[PDB]
């Protein structure tokens, strides 16, 4: 197109053509815009475009074009400043300084092009970071001087100082070397007395709102680092807490400043400082009550109306109050003349806590936790806050959110309310009973409102005495039952009945002491498991298992006046009880029974209960194994497949809760289950052969693989909890490996189940030390074929990827001998696989890859001075060093920095502890006797020279000297690596920076 003309630098730059491309990008649409975008990016990215910025900034009439021009300059200053001829450095400084002055002097430009002036200011700050103060000692004196000649220049200097403070103290950790950061922080510190003088004078005298605001914005940044004396030995707190709170223009920033003041490092033994800290709080609350709103104001309504900046102001007020009071409320708690102030501040917080805004509520709730925790432990404090706490009980009860039956917020709310209940149990009971009456009298009745109250009542379980809890629980359930009777329709009756079951489930102490009642509860849940109304069945089941977890002992003993342990009654009727439940809910029921059965510690009775519980699935199982073995075609019937999967899922559920105790039931099905695994496997392969890979997506084959996956999950679940590992090895492992390994190896990639890898990981984890030949067999069957699935990209087969490196990790931990037995070509694939893991951005893979490398080095080191370890270093030491360096420095693996640094530090320390017993070099390339230390430093210097050719030899050598010296000190070592990552991003980094530590 025509727009592409600006991309030709042999000719002069046509400023009007640039402005057309810019206008089209910012103001255009569709293809025109998209085309101009790619042109502007190509323009900006031309490494000579910076030469044309002085033209653009002089002759363009488009502020966006000038902004881009400054972006181009910014790139150059940040990355290539020190490569320039010194004339250009001075020249670039000169027309940035001049451009800023002339924009401030033109009052029309100063008001209408704030974005361009702000970008020019930031560009200036980049130059300062390069040049100041060592090549610009008069910058600050001349800034202060030019401030008096013009309000506009003075205001813009506040912006420049704000950005400078930000760049030096707030955003330097990542972007500068440690030495450069300290140099700039010290420079600003050295000259800050003069900066503060200018800032205080402007605040004390100035009228220009815009200038006042700019100065306070800069003060906000200063408070991050300046010494407290500038704040407490001047009159600035008075100004901030009176004058600037009355004007709304200055109020938002001033409040933010006062919040930071509340965080200054302050001597705690000076009584004058304490009175100054009281005083600015007193002033601020006074200005709020007289200039903004009284403490009675309805902040919930104000926030909802969302006029002007009210929402941000109320947010900032919450931050100020919570921040100050968490640090300083004790200053207000003893002096009786300060009691009104303390309580007014907290009353504002009460009102802020009624705002409907989840994130702000969490901010106030964090403070409330801070307060009630202190009232719970600190003597003679809680009586001060009795009326505050009473209001808070109502606020929290009325804003209770849904517990697991948001989750984080429920737990925070529960914690505060538990403290509040301990602080006044009588007040809490009264509020809750009162709220319940207004549910019954219909004045506050609603689904949301009865749910909220029920969650609140449930949340304080354990805080009342057992006698008071008993009376309270009875009253609550009586009132709820009357409430349910009173309502009409399945919708309402269902809601109330659920809440009833929720409260009951939250008070196990009460259930444990009232068996008759507990029995009535369970039988009602059983009735509800036949209710078809949506949600009732899920509710009855979740309540059942929740009560069982907490009260299992009372199901396993014979209660007084009962004929048998109640678990027997549950099991006898299990077919009826669950007849109307979905399979998922049936399995939860069986799992609940498994929890009870495991509390029976007489083995013969436990095993009998277990075989009674499993009667229905075992009979279905026996039937199918008799059939499907006779006519393997039957397994193509989707109905038999579904039945089979549900049987196995039932075994998983019971095994999950019984663990080691499940072994007898596993023994009943084990051998036929693995035969079923083989048969299903044959049918999957047969289907893929007859229909193609698409067969893996069909309901038939997905159903068949579900059987295989549940079988593996069952075996994994048992072995992970097994206590008798001799039986695991002698009875379970051999048939398992024979059933699963060859089938995995000899299926096409799309038919291999990643769950095989997961199951093998547990086998190795639990009994790997006992089955060395079995671990070798696992590697042989899954290692190379899985690696070939995942080593062509980072995307395909994501589950196999994760499970693959978890399996290698545990094998490296528990059966390292299996890697020793690998043929050398396969051990090399193992090393390739580890480095392949390094390069993943997926955290699951990357973290394990780096840990495998670390554990592998330690495994090799442990072997002492033997041929395998000698050969390992010769073949792989520098592969691991350079692959680790590669991911450290390539900017695409920041998430693994710490583990990369640890691995690298371990590798370097091997050489500098002479733990490598052979030369790492060849015969020819280095004289005889050269230490591995000298050779490593040499190899690394050459590696970094070729990889980062823009570094000087001096930079590389200083970096390696420091890094090598610091290979026992991880924090310092890491600092030096970060310094190196900064320097490789620019030209001309200072090699003395690597002496920062010392």
């Amino acid at each position: 197109g025509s727009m592409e003309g600006i991309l030709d630098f042999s000719n002069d730059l046509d400023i009007a053509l640039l402005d057309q491309v810019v206008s089209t990008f910012y103001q255009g649409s569709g293809v025109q815009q998209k085309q101009a975008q790619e042109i502007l990016t190509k323009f900006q990215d031309n490494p000579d475009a910076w030469q044309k910025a002085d033209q653009i900034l002089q002759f363009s009439t488009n502020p966006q074009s000038k902004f881009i021009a400054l972006s181009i300059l910014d790139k150059l200053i940040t990355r290539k400043w020190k490569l320039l001829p010194n004339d250009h450095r001075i020249g670039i400084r000169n027309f940035v300084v001049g451009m800023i002055i002339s924009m401030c002097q033109d009052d029309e430009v100063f008001k209408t092009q704030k974005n361009l002036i702000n970008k020019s200011d930031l560009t200036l700050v980049q130059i300062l970071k390069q040049e100041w103060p060592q090549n610009w000692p008069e910058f600050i004196p001349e800034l202060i001087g030019s401030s008096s000649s013009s309000v506009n220049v003075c205001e813009n200097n506040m912006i420049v100082l704000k950005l400078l403070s930000e760049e030096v103290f707030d955003f330097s950790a990542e972007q500068m070397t440690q030495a450069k950061a300290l140099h700039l922080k010290n420079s600003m510190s050295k000259e800050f007395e003069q900066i503060f003088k200018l800032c205080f004078q402007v605040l004390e005298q100035g009228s220009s709102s815009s200038l006042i605001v700019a100065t306070l914005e800069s003060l906000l940044r200063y408070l991050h680092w300046i010494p407290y004396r500038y704040i407490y030995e001047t009159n600035i707190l008075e100004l901030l807490s009176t004058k600037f709170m009355t004007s709304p223009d200055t109020r938002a920033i001033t409040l933010k400043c006062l919040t930071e003041v509340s965080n200054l490092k302050i001597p705690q033994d000076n009584d004058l400082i304490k009175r100054q800290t009281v005083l600015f709080f007193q002033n601020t609350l006074q200005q709020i009550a007289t200039s903004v709103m009284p403490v009675t104001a309805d902040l919930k309504a104000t926030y909802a109306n969302a006029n002007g900046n009210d929402q941000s102001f109320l947010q900032d007020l919450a931050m100020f109050l919570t921040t100050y009071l968490a640090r300083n409320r004790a200053l207000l708690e003893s002096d009786e003349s300060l009691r009104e102030l303390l309580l007014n501040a907290h009353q504002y917080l009460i009102q802020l806590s009624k705002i409907e805004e989840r994130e702000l509520f969490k901010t106030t709730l964090d403070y409330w936790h801070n307060l009630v925790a202190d009232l719970f432990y600190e003597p003679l404090k809680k009586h001060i806050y009795e009326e505050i706490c009473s209001q808070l009980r109502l606020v929290i009860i009325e804003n209770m959110v849904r517990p697991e039956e948001t989750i984080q917020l429920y737990k925070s709310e529960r914690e505060v309310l538990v403290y509040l209940t301990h602080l006044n149990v009588i007040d809490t009971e009264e509020i809750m009973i009162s709220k319940l009456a207004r549910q019954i009298d219909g004045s506050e009745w609603s689904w949301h409102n009865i749910n909220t109250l029920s969650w609140a009542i449930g949340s304080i379980s354990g805080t009342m005495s057992e006698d008071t809890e008993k009376r309270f629980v009875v009253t609550v359930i009586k009132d709820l039952l009357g409430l349910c009777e009173q309502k009409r329709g399945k919708d309402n009756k269902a809601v109330v009945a659920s809440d009833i079951m929720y409260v009951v489930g939250q008070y196990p102490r009460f259930l444990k002491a009232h068996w008759n009642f507990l029995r009535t509860v369970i039988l009602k849940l059983f009735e509800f498991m036949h209710e078809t109304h949506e949600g009732v069945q899920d509710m009855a089941c979740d309540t059942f298992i929740k009560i069982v977890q907490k009260c299992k002992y009372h199901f396993v003993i014979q209660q007084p006046r009962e004929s048998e342990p109640f678990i027997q009654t549950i099991i006898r009727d299990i077919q009826k009880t669950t007849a109307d439940l979905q399979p998922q809910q049936v399995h939860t029921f069986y799992k609940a029974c498994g929890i009870i059965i495991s509390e029976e510690r007489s083995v013969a009775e436990r095993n009998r209960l277990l075989s009674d519980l499993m009667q229905l699935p075992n009979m279905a199982w026996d039937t199918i194994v008799e059939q499907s073995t006779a006519n393997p075609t039957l397994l193509l019937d989707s109905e038999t497949v579904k039945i089979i999967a549900n049987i196995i899922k039932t075994n998983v559920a019971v095994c999950t809760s019984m663990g080691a105790d499940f072994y007898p039931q596993l023994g009943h099905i084990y051998y036929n289950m693995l035969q079923l695994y083989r048969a299903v496997s044959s049918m999957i392969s047969a289907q893929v052969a007859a229909e193609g890979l698409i067969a893996t997506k069909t309901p038939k084959v997905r159903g068949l693989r579900t059987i295989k996956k549940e079988i593996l999950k069952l075996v994994e679940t048992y072995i992970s909890k097994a206590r008798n590992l001799d039986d695991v090895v002698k009875v379970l492992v051999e048939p398992l490996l024979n059933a699963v390994l060859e089938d995995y190896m000899n299926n096409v990639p799309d038919a291999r189940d990643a769950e095989v890898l997961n199951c093998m990981t547990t086998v190795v984890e639990k009994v790997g030390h006992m089955i060395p030949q079995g671990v070798i067999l696992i590697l042989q069957s899954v290692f190379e074929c899985t690696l070939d699935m995942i080593n062509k990209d980072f995307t395909e087969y994501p589950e196999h990827r994760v499970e693959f490196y978890k399996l290698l990790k545990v094998i490296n931990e528990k059966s390292f001998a299996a890697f020793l037995e690998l043929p050398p070509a396969a051990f090399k694939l193992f090393v390739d696989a580890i480095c392949w893991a390094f390069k993943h951005n997926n955290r699951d893979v990357e973290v394990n890859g780096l840990q495998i490398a670390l554990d592998l080095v330690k495994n090799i080191e442990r072997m002492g001075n033997v041929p395998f370890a000698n050969e390992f270093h010769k073949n792989y030491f520098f592969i691991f060093v350079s692959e680790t360096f590669f991911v450290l420095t390539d900017s695409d693996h920041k998430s693994g920095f710490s583990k990369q640094a640890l691995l690298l530090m371990k590798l370097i320390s091997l050489v500098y502890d002479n733990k490598i017993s052979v030369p790492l070099y060849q015969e020819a390339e280095v004289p005889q006797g050269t230490s591995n230390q000298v050779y490593l430093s040499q190899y690394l210097a050459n590696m970094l020279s070729n990889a980062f050719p823009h570094l000087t030899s001096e930079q590389i050598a200083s970096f390696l000297s420091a890094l090598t010296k610091q290979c026992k000190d991880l924090v310092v070592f890491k600092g030096t690596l970060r310094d190196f990552l900064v320097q490789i991003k620019e030209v001309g980094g200072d090699p003395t920076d690597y002496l920062f530590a010392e």
């Binding site: 039952l481 009756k493 009945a497 009535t520 109304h533």
Partner: peptide, 9 residues
Amino acid sequence: IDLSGLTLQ
């Protein structure tokens, strides 16, 4: 408590 009588109808 007469929880036995709780009913959704």
